[model samples]
Target: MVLSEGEWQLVLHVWAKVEADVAGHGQDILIRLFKSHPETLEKFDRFKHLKTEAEMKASEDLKKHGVTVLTALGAILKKKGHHEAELKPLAQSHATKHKIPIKYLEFISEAIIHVLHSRHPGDFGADAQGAMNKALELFRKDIAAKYKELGYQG
Candidate 1:
């Protein structure tokens, strides 16, 4: 459930590069998530109407949510990969309030990696990707556990 020191370092290394453009990368990650899994768009009232790529990219709401997403990720990283600290409440809300499916929670990780690899091709290499995947897997598991606890059969 925990990343080793080296894994944390690798994740943080690429994350530092991503820090410069959280708005850009975060929105792009969301865009990738929406495009790949259109169902996710319905999870957000603000973003649901963004039917076109142009509309999705141009929305202030999407930009803000993107920043929020990346900022939350940054917080997890800031704690040296302590996911539960931040994710517990997020899991609680997503399960009980948002009523999202467990499988959909996993989609963000894919979108994250895709955006990272495309945006920072050289920095987000195999090792970094591996570390990112491991970190996000922990994130997904924490949230999914909450879903199970709340009797969300999905």
Candidate 2:
């Protein structure tokens, strides 16, 4: 599921634009995730009662947290085979301290797809989706073994 240069470039281009507007685009992706999985709200105290679009966007902490999230996601998407080193700490922290489930992490790929389609319009199509799918799949693979040892499915 690892992406070649062309595949990653397809999605990274959009991701860069999204990163540039981290305040708006990041919140957009986060809100989409929370909506897609209502159970996810409990994972973050910052998202407190942000059940509406206006509330989600207007939250000051969420805007800052959006940059944080983009940084983490950006790092996770870098390189080819060695991302596990950078990603493992986050996964362990979320899993051990926060108890965030693997399924919730899966929402990241969905969120990216959601943003690309809606924000970029016809700029990206199936090939973008394909790259995104593989990028996420590779991420899952990187963490799967450790999670598997803990009786967690990746």
Candidate 3:
């Protein structure tokens, strides 16, 4: 699901705000992700113990990992059609090394949507949300494909 120019525009419009404070927003995304799915937090031994909101917020690890995740999506947005170049290695490492489940892609998307809309109540309207949903789905599809190629059953 390659994004159309209009879809790209719709997503990028709101991305400007999200990217402005990638660390802060990324931290929020992870917080939401872990809160919504505590099991996911268990996947990270270091972060699993951070039960309180304040603990999660103060953790530098959370902030750095969040930035890494958000920046990855930002890179995919720029590459568009050629995103497979980025996804292949990410899939390889995530599948073999990180052992991250493909389902987490959608989880991350949900976190991102929640963060964006809740943070920018007025600007992140329906259309922008829709566009971001599509883009994130594309990310999911490509990452899943690479997982399949690498024979990562999970």
Candidate 4:
């Protein structure tokens, strides 16, 4: 389930792009990702919904943090290439908090591409798969680094 540096980079890049356009497209992407991988919804349900307004605000705050992390990671990867060491904590945090297998991140990437392709049709071309592969690498690195920062050993 371990992703190579290249794969993680692609995931992070795409994730960052999606998050950047979140107000316009993020909700759709989330809906699609969740629909394609329903387990992801269950795993992060705590962050996805709130029973109270205060709780909803708190969830939004947490989501902002996640967005910041992903956006920053995406920028770094796009501008300076992959920062494998920097992303380890991110991967760890996701694994620990969501109990998602590192491998499942690949599925998430696939789902993203699937949604994008379904919506845009042939816009992605053959390179779409290549893009997803890079994205998976970025996802792993970011999640791993974030988790490590939060004291997640695994």
Best-fitting candidate, measured by lDDT? 3
Candidate 4 positional error at 55, Å: 17
Worst 10 residues of 1 by lDDT: 88-97
Candidate 1 vs 4: which has more lDDT: 1
Q: Could you arrange the candidates by TM-score from highest to lowest?
A: 3, 1, 2, 4
Model 2 Cα lDDT, one tens digit per residue, 31-142? 7887787677877765757787778778877767667777766777766446445456633322123545567768766986788789886656888878877887777665
Which RMSD does model 3 reach against the true structure? 2.5
Question: Model 4 over residues 77-119: C-alpha lDDT tens digits?
Answer: 4533435554344322441264455555566566556655665
In angstroms, the error of model 3 at 62 is: 0.4
| Shift in Å, residue 84, candidate 2 | 6.7
Is candidate 1 or 4 superior in TM-score?
A: 1
State which candidate has the highest TM-score.
3
lDDT of 4: 0.51
lDDT of 3: 0.79
List TM-score per model, in order.
Answer: 0.84, 0.79, 0.88, 0.52
**Residue 24, candidate 1: C-alpha displacement in angstroms:** 0.5
Q: Please state the error at residue 109 of candidate 4 in Å.
A: 0.6
Please write out the lDDT profile of model 3 over residues 11-91, one tens digit for every residue.
887888878899999999999998898788767756867888889989988888888888877877766546445356652
Displacement of residue 116 (Cα, Å) in model 4 is 2.5
Model 4 worst lDDT run, 10 consecutive residues? 87-96
What range of 10 consecutive residues in model 3 has the weakest lDDT sum? 90-99
